[PDB]
């Protein structure tokens, strides 16, 4: 859960900061249209909002599946699979981060 919140608190620092290109002003929208290309701008931020909600889904499952671990050799594996499937979302997100 603590790693799961750790990725979201970084993602909540991205989706809050960027200036929300629709409904700013039709001038500030339209400098950023020519200079930053609205399509690539809106797709990459919506990829992270997809990537934020998948971290919440994996964190809420692997705490809920972990409550029936009957040994140490089973509870360790649910910890590693919970961190690995979050790393899969990050490695997949390698290209939209360098643009942002």
């Amino acid at each position: 859960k603590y790693t799961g919140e750790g990725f979201v608190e970084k993602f909540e620092d991205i989706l809050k900061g960027f200036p929300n290109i629709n409904d700013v002003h039709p001038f500030h929208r339209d400098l950023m249209d020519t200079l930053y290309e609205k399509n690539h701008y809106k797709i990459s931020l919506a990829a992270i909002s997809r990537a934020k909600s998948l971290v919440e889904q994996v964190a809420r499952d692997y705490v809920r599946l972990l409550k029936f671990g009957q040994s140490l050799f089973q509870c360790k594996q649910l910890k590693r699979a919970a961190l690995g499937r979050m790393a899969t979302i990050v490695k997949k997100l390698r290209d939209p981060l360098a643009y942002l």
């Binding site: 499952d61 692997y62 809920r64 599946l65 409550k67 029936f68 671990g69 009957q70 089973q74 594996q77 649910l78 699979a81 499937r85």
Partner: protein
């Protein structure tokens, strides 16, 4: 397939006020539960299949064309290590399950259409919530 003891996947549930009723058992491993299930009463039941450990869908990888498709499970035909866990549904490893194929749309002899296959799971779902099953070709 390693040998799975019966002392695991069964939990001593000591019930009542004075915790001395060592009767009830809980399956601590993963289970397909069926489509229409409607739990039996608590005074009537003996064996408990919990709510969190019920995987409905499974990752179905195909050796031919190399495509992994996320497909739902319909039935559990063959379970090793007893015929008893066939009726229960314990889904450890080597369990052959009956998986539909509707999105693939394969063509048979006569070309009517194929809508279901047989797939064998390949990993313990205790280690991860994913259920990986190689569709047997």
């Amino acid at each position: 397939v390693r040998g799975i003891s019966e002392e695991e996947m069964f939990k001593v549930i000591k019930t009542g006020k004075s915790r001395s009723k060592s009767w009830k058992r809980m399956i601590t491993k993963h289970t397909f539960v069926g489509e229409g299930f409607t739990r039996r009463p608590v005074k009537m039941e003996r064996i408990i299949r919990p709510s969190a450990l019920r995987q409905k869908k499974a990752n179905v990888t195909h050796p031919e064309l190399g495509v992994t498709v996320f497909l739902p499970i319909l039935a559990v035909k063959k379970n090793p290590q007893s015929p008893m866990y066939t009726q229960l549904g314990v889904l450890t490893k080597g369990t052959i399950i009956e998986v539909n194929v509707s999105e693939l749309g394969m063509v048979t002899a006569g070309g009517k259409v194929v809508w279901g296959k047989y797939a064998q799971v390949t990993n313990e779902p205790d280690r991860d919530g994913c259920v990986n099953a190689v569709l047997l070709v």
